Design an enzyme around this catalytic site. Structure first.
Site, PDB file in Angstrom:
ATOM      1  N   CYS A 134       4.439  -4.521  -8.785  1.00 10.16           N
ATOM      2  CA  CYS A 134       4.443  -3.067  -8.621  1.00 10.16           C
ATOM      3  C   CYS A 134       3.221  -2.449  -9.300  1.00 10.16           C
ATOM      4  CB  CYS A 134       5.727  -2.465  -9.197  1.00 10.16           C
ATOM      5  SG  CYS A 134       5.831  -0.692  -9.002  1.00 10.16           S
ATOM      6  N   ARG A 165       4.048   1.004 -12.045  1.00  9.38           N
ATOM      7  CA  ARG A 165       4.883   0.942 -13.243  1.00  9.38           C
ATOM      8  C   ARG A 165       4.453   1.853 -14.397  1.00  9.38           C
ATOM      9  NH1 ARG A 165       4.408  -5.149 -14.502  1.00  9.38           N
ATOM     10  NH2 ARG A 165       2.642  -5.061 -13.007  1.00  9.38           N
ATOM     11  N   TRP A 210       7.779   6.879  -4.804  1.00  5.06           N
ATOM     12  CA  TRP A 210       7.016   7.605  -3.796  1.00  5.06           C
ATOM     13  C   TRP A 210       5.903   6.704  -3.260  1.00  5.06           C
ATOM     14  CZ3 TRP A 210       7.458   9.865  -8.806  1.00  5.06           C
ATOM     15  CH2 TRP A 210       6.390   9.580  -9.675  1.00  5.06           C
ATOM     16  N   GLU A 267       0.489   2.076   2.043  1.00  7.40           N
ATOM     17  CA  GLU A 267       1.712   1.433   2.501  1.00  7.40           C
ATOM     18  C   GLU A 267       2.120   1.948   3.872  1.00  7.40           C
ATOM     19  OE1 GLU A 267       4.790   0.641  -0.652  1.00  7.40           O
ATOM     20  OE2 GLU A 267       3.869   2.440  -1.529  1.00  7.40           O
TER      21      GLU A 267
HETATM   22  C1  HEM Z   1       6.953   5.592  -8.759  1.00  7.21           C
HETATM   23  C2  HEM Z   1       6.252   5.349  -7.648  1.00  7.21           C
HETATM   24  C3  HEM Z   1       6.031   3.900  -7.144  1.00  7.21           C
HETATM   25  C4  HEM Z   1       4.933   3.451  -6.528  1.00  7.21           C
HETATM   26  C5  HEM Z   1       3.633   4.218  -6.217  1.00  7.21           C
HETATM   27  C6  HEM Z   1       5.143   2.068  -6.197  1.00  7.21           C
HETATM   28  C7  HEM Z   1       4.219   1.271  -5.575  1.00  7.21           C
HETATM   29  C8  HEM Z   1       4.466  -0.013  -5.168  1.00  7.21           C
HETATM   30  C9  HEM Z   1       3.705  -0.735  -4.170  1.00  7.21           C
HETATM   31  C10 HEM Z   1       2.483  -0.182  -3.405  1.00  7.21           C
HETATM   32  C11 HEM Z   1       4.238  -1.946  -4.048  1.00  7.21           C
HETATM   33  C12 HEM Z   1       3.744  -3.025  -3.074  1.00  7.21           C
HETATM   34  C13 HEM Z   1       4.394  -2.622  -1.752  1.00  7.21           C
HETATM   35  C14 HEM Z   1       3.888  -3.380  -0.557  1.00  7.21           C
HETATM   36  O1  HEM Z   1       2.784  -3.959  -0.645  1.00  7.21           O
HETATM   37  O2  HEM Z   1       4.580  -3.382   0.494  1.00  7.21           O
HETATM   38  C15 HEM Z   1       5.364  -2.034  -4.957  1.00  7.21           C
HETATM   39  C16 HEM Z   1       6.182  -3.115  -5.137  1.00  7.21           C
HETATM   40  C17 HEM Z   1       7.316  -3.088  -5.917  1.00  7.21           C
HETATM   41  N1  HEM Z   1       7.816  -2.002  -6.628  1.00  7.21           N
HETATM   42 FE1  HEM Z   1       6.927  -0.209  -6.929  1.00  7.21          FE
HETATM   43  N2  HEM Z   1       6.399   1.688  -6.618  1.00  7.21           N
HETATM   44  C18 HEM Z   1       6.983   2.803  -7.201  1.00  7.21           C
HETATM   45  C19 HEM Z   1       8.253   2.854  -7.728  1.00  7.21           C
HETATM   46  C20 HEM Z   1       9.047   1.760  -7.999  1.00  7.21           C
HETATM   47  C21 HEM Z   1      10.368   1.785  -8.592  1.00  7.21           C
HETATM   48  C22 HEM Z   1      11.093   3.090  -8.992  1.00  7.21           C
HETATM   49  C23 HEM Z   1      10.802   0.510  -8.670  1.00  7.21           C
HETATM   50  C24 HEM Z   1      12.122  -0.070  -9.245  1.00  7.21           C
HETATM   51  C25 HEM Z   1      12.815   0.599 -10.175  1.00  7.21           C
HETATM   52  C26 HEM Z   1       9.753  -0.336  -8.146  1.00  7.21           C
HETATM   53  C27 HEM Z   1       9.793  -1.696  -8.065  1.00  7.21           C
HETATM   54  C28 HEM Z   1       8.969  -2.437  -7.258  1.00  7.21           C
HETATM   55  C29 HEM Z   1       9.183  -3.827  -6.942  1.00  7.21           C
HETATM   56  C30 HEM Z   1      10.343  -4.696  -7.451  1.00  7.21           C
HETATM   57  C31 HEM Z   1       8.199  -4.218  -6.137  1.00  7.21           C
HETATM   58  C32 HEM Z   1       8.006  -5.634  -5.559  1.00  7.21           C
HETATM   59  C33 HEM Z   1       8.692  -5.817  -4.217  1.00  7.21           C
HETATM   60  C34 HEM Z   1       8.599  -7.285  -3.847  1.00  7.21           C
HETATM   61  O3  HEM Z   1       8.505  -8.167  -4.751  1.00  7.21           O
HETATM   62  O4  HEM Z   1       8.634  -7.583  -2.632  1.00  7.21           O
HETATM   63  N3  HEM Z   1       8.710   0.450  -7.736  1.00  7.21           N
HETATM   64  N4  HEM Z   1       5.480  -0.830  -5.622  1.00  7.21           N
HETATM   65  C1  LIG Z   2      10.071   1.627  -5.052  1.00  9.55           C
HETATM   66  C2  LIG Z   2       8.894   1.384  -4.149  1.00  9.55           C
HETATM   67  C3  LIG Z   2       7.933   2.371  -3.960  1.00  9.55           C
HETATM   68  C4  LIG Z   2       6.856   2.107  -3.111  1.00  9.55           C
HETATM   69  N1  LIG Z   2       5.904   3.045  -2.903  1.00  9.55           N
HETATM   70  N2  LIG Z   2       6.760   0.919  -2.474  1.00  9.55           N
HETATM   71  C5  LIG Z   2       7.675  -0.054  -2.641  1.00  9.55           C
HETATM   72  C6  LIG Z   2       7.537  -1.273  -1.976  1.00  9.55           C
HETATM   73  C7  LIG Z   2       8.464  -2.299  -2.165  1.00  9.55           C
HETATM   74  C8  LIG Z   2       8.391  -3.591  -1.412  1.00  9.55           C
HETATM   75  C9  LIG Z   2       7.253  -4.002  -0.740  1.00  9.55           C
HETATM   76  C10 LIG Z   2       7.254  -5.193  -0.014  1.00  9.55           C
HETATM   77  C11 LIG Z   2       8.402  -5.975   0.077  1.00  9.55           C
HETATM   78  O1  LIG Z   2       8.374  -7.132   0.824  1.00  9.55           O
HETATM   79  C12 LIG Z   2       8.198  -6.963   2.237  1.00  9.55           C
HETATM   80  C13 LIG Z   2       8.633  -8.159   3.049  1.00  9.55           C
HETATM   81  C14 LIG Z   2       8.998  -8.337   4.377  1.00  9.55           C
HETATM   82  N3  LIG Z   2       9.329  -9.635   4.681  1.00  9.55           N
HETATM   83  C15 LIG Z   2       9.252 -10.535   3.654  1.00  9.55           C
HETATM   84  S1  LIG Z   2       8.733  -9.676   2.239  1.00  9.55           S
HETATM   85  C16 LIG Z   2       9.559  -5.548  -0.555  1.00  9.55           C
HETATM   86  C17 LIG Z   2      10.836  -6.366  -0.466  1.00  9.55           C
HETATM   87  N4  LIG Z   2      11.907  -5.655   0.268  1.00  9.55           N
HETATM   88  C18 LIG Z   2       9.545  -4.359  -1.276  1.00  9.55           C
HETATM   89  C19 LIG Z   2       9.545  -2.062  -3.001  1.00  9.55           C
HETATM   90  C20 LIG Z   2       9.690  -0.846  -3.661  1.00  9.55           C
HETATM   91  C21 LIG Z   2       8.748   0.160  -3.493  1.00  9.55           C
END
Ligand code: HEM
Ligand SMILES: Cc1cc(N)nc2cc(-c3ccc(OCc4cncs4)c(CN)c3)ccc12
Ligand code: HEM
Ligand SMILES: Cc1cc(N)nc2cc(-c3ccc(OCc4cncs4)c(CN)c3)ccc12
Ligand SMILES: C[C@H](O)[C@H](O)[C@H]1CNc2nc(N)[nH]c(=O)c2N1
Ligand SMILES: C[C@H](O)[C@H](O)[C@H]1CNc2nc(N)[nH]c(=O)c2N1
Ligand SMILES: [Zn+2]
Lengths: 416, 412
Positions: free
Chosen positions: A114, A117, A286, A291
């Site tokens: 993420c 964070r 947000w 994305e």
């Molecule tokens: C506050 C604004 C936030 C922004 C700008 C943000 C941004 C992002 C982005 C750009 C990604 C990669 C997404 C992708 O490439 O598809 C990501 C992944 C992730 N975010 Fe954040 N996020 C936010 C909030 C949060 C919150 C509130 C949580 C959990 C409490 C969180 C947990 C995660 C997790 C666990 C991933 C990894 C997903 C995975 O492993 O597939 N995020 N975030």
């Molecule tokens: C809270 C929040 C805010 C944000 N702005 N962005 C997010 C993107 C994610 C994310 C991004 C890619 C993922 O993996 C995609 C995949 C499809 N197929 C195999 S992995 C997953 C897993 N659900 C989560 C999770 C949380 C987000």
């Protein structure tokens, strides 16, 4: 393992020292002789036994009491004894509200992938562990959407449904996000709507959903409570905030009929705290513009409007070396940021988010001794090197509490 | 165990068996991954050297389908007697070429490896002086340049012996522009080479103090002090950067050299170390137009290009940096192509590499690949390598990093 580890920033020369990696608790998938840093993910009966749960809970409880500067205190030893007694008699235990909130914030703080964070400690936590039915899950989820949306002034939030017990009574949100658009494969092979969502759309239609069959149909919620078969619910459309996509210079961009939803709300991951498993825990923040602007629109197996944008731009699409793809990608991402800002829906460009993340990472190294980061995911999908995370070295490692992947529920559900 | 890698855009799955043949470390453990550390973490002995030599000979004679033949059994015994009597050994020409092509084939960070078996290998193991090095390098430069129709090449100078007699090319690339650290703070020329530029001045070089001054070669032979040589200018092919729509682009006064020739790495074959082995191919457009011109510590013309594009530079959310980066890269590709100088755009290159991966998994059981380095520094996800899962591991022969020479060299 060596006790200090240095990461270097090759653009600014700053060197940081990571000691926190020594607290890592689970495997990355790498070995001494292979690196799986680009692998995306490196039984219902199986729940944590009494013996496995004891060390995992004490680990977490210790860490919590250390965080509130009460480690080794009477309140700490008493809580240890009480947690241990519950596990002994009931094979599980219940988290206190304080520890639930701490554990959720730290699963986000520990989320190496993420870039958002810097916000980790301003997370609204909704305790939904009293939920018993899928209607109740629908109530909690609607209240989450409305709060987080806040009329466009988005706020980050997580709703935590009951933990796993015997594995045959799980709560699950079958949707991958709370708000997504349907995708429909046509008998001629083409796709209407969002191609990423064709499979879940088909499941919904089998479960009774009447599809409007449009480009931007918000999918229903498919919700499973206490291990029962999942149920359908339409989200009140007034709760789904949406932005029509237009361009500050190209008047024709609106004529593409594109729009997107304001709230990214991931609902298919698992929250692990003190060895407890919260298989339903939707969380939202947000969008970063890319994305939507790079992935949600320009990915070939997504809305693939790259060609359509380049056509209206009068670009030579006969050779790749014209960079017509790259030029269309920038304009689309320009439109996306401009449409969200005009309608005052929160959104962050990838320059500002990566620059926040560097500042955040440094403070974590200072105050915490490290910050796990997954470079493959932290770096944006466009203009990588003109963002400061590109030249930033990172160490990746898994701390707990954490958000984990879990199998899709239709693959595992025992149908009643 | 077998290992699978999936492409999330095509859902093609490949199976890797080749990783089982590696034994060099990556720097990761089961608990900490170091995939984004640039250098995660030198005199051999007869004791370490024989098994390293044994493995290489085995894979050479296995590659030519003559494992356990008389020539293989006798090359084994021949190498044994020589490490015995001389503490090292010398590679046959056949083995020098095979190992050099395979060090390129094994370069996990290189997106250009579909070309790996098309490599002109220049044996310079008879060199003894810096004058000889400069003759071998001019020949390299001139062969590889080929009047714009670039050709891949490597020149291999004598191997390390006892560490006190290393051959070294002190330049990081054979052709680069000087960087001049101004009194008024900023930088004239190329900021990547400001240190090396001053080391050349400190050795006697007379700087023209222009913006595109080709640095001299600084050449170390058999452990001696390095010596300055100017590459003859007609050997140095350059491209003036202009833009197919913005006629004001030529007025920026920019240009680059055509030949990328990395000269500071170490080639390791069969336990032997080649501390001077300049190798060259041709450019991917982004190496110049993204990194060489737009990194903070580089030419940093981004601001000026957005200037002449009359873009709104007050807030980052207008993506003026992104618009300028794309146009700079359009010009670079457009100029090299107009001059018929070989260049590849990052779409075609990554696309060829996916094809190269397919070939490797079929005939070879895998392809080590460093996603952090394979993905281009712009437009990542609209290229096919973004969605391609890669497995990174260290096969030998290989190209390695070594310390800069001005840190180790016992001066005199
Ligand atoms: C506050 C604004 C936030 C922004 C700008 C943000 C941004 C992002 C982005 C750009 C990604 C990669 C997404 C992708 O490439 O598809 C990501 C992944 C992730 N975010 Fe954040 N996020 C936010 C909030 C949060 C919150 C509130 C949580 C959990 C409490 C969180 C947990 C995660 C997790 C666990 C991933 C990894 C997903 C995975 O492993 O597939 N995020 N975030
Ligand atoms: C809270 C929040 C805010 C944000 N702005 N962005 C997010 C993107 C994610 C994310 C991004 C890619 C993922 O993996 C995609 C995949 C499809 N197929 C195999 S992995 C997953 C897993 N659900 C989560 C999770 C949380 C987000
Ligand atoms: C023939 C055309 C070639 C192209 C287009 C090409 C392209 C590239 C690119 C874009 C990089 C990453 C550079 C960066 O962005 O920092 C790279 C790295 C590399 N290339 Fe290739 N390359 C080519 C040929 C070669 C040849 C002939 C060799 C050696 C025989 C070679 C060995 C390497 C190595 C070792 C690296 C990684 C260096 C490191 O670990 O830091 N390449 N190449
Ligand atoms: C043959 C060929 C063709 C080409 N078209 N491109 C190349 C780029 C490279 C490269 C790129 C970055 C590096 O960077 C590491 C460091 C820089 N500074 C401190 S470590 C190095 C190692 N010198 C090599 C090497 C070879 C290339
Ligand atoms: C810290 C990071 O590993 C380092 O800056 C790497 C990242 N990826 C890269 N990728 C390419 N193509 N070229 C580079 O120089 C780098 N640098
Ligand atoms: C194969 C590869 O790991 C995969 O496509 C990853 C690469 N990095 C990514 N990075 C982010 N932020 N989001 C992604 O979906 C991906 N996809
Ligand atoms: Zn790793």
């Amino acid at each position: 393992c060596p006790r200090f580890l240095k990461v270097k920033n090759w653009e600014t020369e700053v060197v940081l020292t990571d000691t926190l990696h020594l607290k890592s608790t689970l495997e990355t998938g790498c070995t001494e002789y292979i690196c799986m840093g680009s692998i995306m993910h490196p039984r219902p009966e199986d729940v944590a036994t009494k013996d496995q749960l004891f060390p995992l809970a004490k680990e977490f409880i210790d860490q919590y009491y250390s965080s509130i500067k009460r480690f080794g205190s009477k309140a700490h030893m008493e809580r240890l004894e009480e947690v241990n007694k519950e596990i002994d008699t009931t094979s599980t235990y219940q988290l206190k509200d304080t520890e639930l909130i701490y554990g959720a914030k730290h699963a986000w703080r520990n989320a190496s992938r993420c870039v958002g964070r810097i916000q980790w400690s301003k997370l609204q936590v909704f305790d939904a562990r009293d939920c018993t039915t899928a209607h109740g899950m629908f109530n909690y989820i609607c209240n989450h959407v409305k709060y987080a949306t806040n009329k466009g002034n988005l706020r980050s939030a997580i709703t935590i449904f009951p933990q796993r017990t015997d594995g045959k009574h799980d709560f699950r949100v079958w949707n991958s996000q709370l708000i997504r658009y349907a995708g429909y494969k046509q008998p001629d092979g083409s796709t209407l709507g969002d191609p990423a969502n064709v499979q879940f759309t088909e499941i919904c239609i089998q479960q009774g959903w009447k599809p409007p069959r449009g480009r931007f149909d918000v999918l229903p919620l498919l919700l499973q409570a206490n291990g029962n078969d999942p149920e359908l619910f339409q989200i009140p459309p007034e709760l789904v905030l949406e932005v029509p996509i237009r361009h500050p210079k190209f008047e024709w961009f609106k004529d593409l009929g594109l729009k997107w939803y304001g709230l990214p709300a991931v609902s298919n991951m698992l929250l692990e705290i003190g060895g407890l498993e919260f298989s339903a825990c939707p969380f939202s923040g947000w969008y970063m513009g890319t994305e939507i602007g790079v992935r949600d629109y320009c990915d070939n197996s997504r809305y693939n409007i790259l060609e359509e944008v380049a056509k209206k731009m009068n670009l030579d699409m006969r050779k790749t070396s014209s960079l017509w793809k790259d030029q269309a990608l920038v304009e689309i991402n320009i439109a996306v940021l401009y449409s969200f800002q005009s309608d005052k829906v929160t959104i962050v460009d990838h320059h500002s988010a990566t620059e926040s993340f560097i500042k955040h990472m440094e403070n974590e190294y200072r105050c915490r001794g490290g910050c796990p980061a997954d470079w493959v995911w932290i770096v944006p999908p466009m203009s990588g090197s003109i963002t400061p995370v590109f030249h930033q070295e990172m160490l990746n490692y898994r701390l707990t509490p954490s958000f984990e992947y879990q199998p899709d529920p239709w693959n595992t559900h025992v149908w009643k």
